[PDB]
């Protein structure tokens, strides 16, 4: 530190005294992030393991709100043949929130899954289900021949093929009106140019891949001016104490040391500031306790040395720090036989003004030579 003092004072000769040279700070180790426990899972399990399934003409719509959408539980299974999504990619839908979710579920033919593609116009893509001009979701589909196929077949599933005009978006028209044509209007009967819109599905093991029943669930995310309610899951790491780190508590970002406290916060209170309008204490979102934030240690660096003519022995003073953080606060990385010897050793003394290294504490009292603070003086003479 004699070299640092010479560089700061811009003089190779240093007079007897104390001089401030630089500053030291403590940096966060890696990071800390915390969030409340995830206990508001959306009821996707009921849809995944539904006992009864709805027909196309009665495709079922489900409202999803005020719950966390954890799609990883179904994504890791990878048991769905069709995993197409639009608006947001499946691997990056976690980092954005929506205020509502529509879940439309039905069972169709295996080759008709493409008919559920957004914006398609066709016999099934217009006359059974319609979609708006914007999509922010998925059109997931999977095979359902294991459960929906049984001996003897089923006739409770109907599809619409004939209708007057295209369906209005987000409408489920459950009607049995017979289609009529202007060339020959039956007007009350099912004669020429008049047929039932709905035909029954054919369930049998001999059906091919295209004819095999497939369960299709289309999910549509949506956000409006109203506050968002369906947010993706946020991972919270382990909580560390008595260590300087950059912490993120419920979106509040700070840097410092989190230490256990005895403050009794109100049940509705999350954090607590001080008179100076700075964050002081934080409640752990997962488990209930209060942690105070110490704004690191930092401080000033002062060099204690006599005149260069007298000798070259030097001492190091750190301001407002305990004698435990000195080897970590930007240290032990400089040149070894010069700086590393002035960070640790048996000459470390703790004073009210901070930590002093390079001087020996003696019970005797003499006239002050180099003042430090709080009635502390360093002298080169023994």
């Amino acid at each position, epitope marked *: 530190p004699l070299s640092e003092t010479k560089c700061t004072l811009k003089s190779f000769t240093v007079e007897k005294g104390i001089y401030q040279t630089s500053n030291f700070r403590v940096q966060p180790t890696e990071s800390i992030v915390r969030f409340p426990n995830i206990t508001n899972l959306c009821p996707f399990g009921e849809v995944f393991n539904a006992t009864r399934f709805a027909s196309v003409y009665a495709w079922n719509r489900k409202r999803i709100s005020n719950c966390v959408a954890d799609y990883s539980v179904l994504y890791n299974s990878a048991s769905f043949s069709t995993f*197409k999504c639009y608006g947001v990619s499946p691997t990056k839908l976690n980092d954005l929130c929506f205020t509502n979710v529509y879940a439309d579920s039905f069972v169709i033919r295996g080759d008709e899954v*493409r008919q559920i593609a957004p*914006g*398609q116009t066709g016999k099934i893509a217009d006359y059974n289900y319609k979609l708006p001009d914007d999509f922010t979701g998925c059109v997931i589909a999977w095979n359902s021949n294991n459960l929906d196929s049984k001996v003897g077949g089923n006739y409770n599933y109907l599809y619409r093929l004939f209708r007057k005009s295209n369906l209005k978006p987000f409408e489920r028209d459950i009607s049995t009106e017979i289609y009529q044509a202007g060339s020959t209007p039956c007007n009350g009967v099912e004669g020429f140019n008049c047929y039932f819109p709905l035909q029954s599905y054919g369930f049998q093991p001999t059906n091919g891949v295209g004819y095999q029943p497939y369960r299709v669930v289309v999910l549509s995310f949506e956000l409006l001016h109203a506050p968002a309610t369906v947010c993706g899951p946020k991972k919270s790491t382990n909580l560390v104490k008595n260590k300087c780190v950059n912490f993120n508590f419920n979106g509040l970002t700070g840097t410092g040391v989190l230490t256990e406290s005895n403050k009794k916060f109100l049940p509705f209170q999350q954090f607590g500031r001080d008179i100076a309008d700075t964050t002081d204490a934080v409640r752990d979102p997962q488990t209930l306790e209060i942690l105070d934030i110490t704004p690191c240690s930092f401080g000033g660096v002062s060099v204690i040395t006599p005149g260069t003519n007298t000798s070259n022995q030097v001492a190091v003073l750190y301001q407002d720090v305990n004698c435990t953080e000195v080897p970590v606060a930007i240290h032990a990385d400089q040149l070894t036989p010069t700086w590393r010897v002035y960070s640790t050793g048996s000459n470390v003394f703790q004073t009210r003004a901070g930590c002093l290294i390079g001087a020996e504490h003696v019970n005797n009292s003499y006239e002050c030579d180099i003042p430090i603070g709080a009635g502390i003086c360093a002298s080169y003479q023994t």
Partner: nanobody, 127 residues
Framework: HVQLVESGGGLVQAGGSLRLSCAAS????????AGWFRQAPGKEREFVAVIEWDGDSAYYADPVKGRFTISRDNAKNTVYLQMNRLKPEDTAVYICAVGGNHYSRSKYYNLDEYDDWGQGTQVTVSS
């Protein structure tokens, strides 16, 4: 009724550049992911390129990797395929399809995963 029209094709000299424009007329063009495929006599049908709604991420086949560019324009409801450093082996009929966004690599070889099918345009190289 999203009508698809193809233009910009024809016969071009070797070593030049080409631009094939596929225009889709409809109210759901933005919801469609644009796929481009090629077909040549004596060769099996192979997937060429696919681009999403925003166009930031696009997927191209290995034989045509790093050789052609794809772009979109929602305001004009058009998609453009730029061929650079053209070769005589690229003389073929190109087809543009709109509808559905796919993420499976093995599912890009099927033309049944798109809503509407167009007519395509012929690209020929003169030596």
């Amino acid at each position: 009724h999203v009508q698809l029209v193809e233009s910009g094709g024809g016969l071009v000299q070797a070593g030049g550049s080409l631009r094939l424009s596929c225009a889709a007329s409809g109210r759901t063009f933005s919801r469609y992911a644009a796929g481009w495929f090629r077909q040549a006599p004596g060769k099996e049908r192979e997937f060429v390129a696919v681009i999403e709604w925003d166009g930031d991420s696009a997927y191209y086949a290995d034989p045509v990797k790093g050789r052609f560019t794809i772009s979109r324009d929602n305001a004009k409801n058009t998609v453009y395929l730029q061929m650079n450093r053209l070769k005589p082996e690229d003389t073929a009929v190109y087809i543009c399809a709109v509808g559905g966004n796919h993420y499976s690599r093995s599912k890009y070889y099927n033309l049944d995963e798109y809503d509407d099918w167009g007519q395509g345009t012929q690209v020929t190289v003169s030596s």
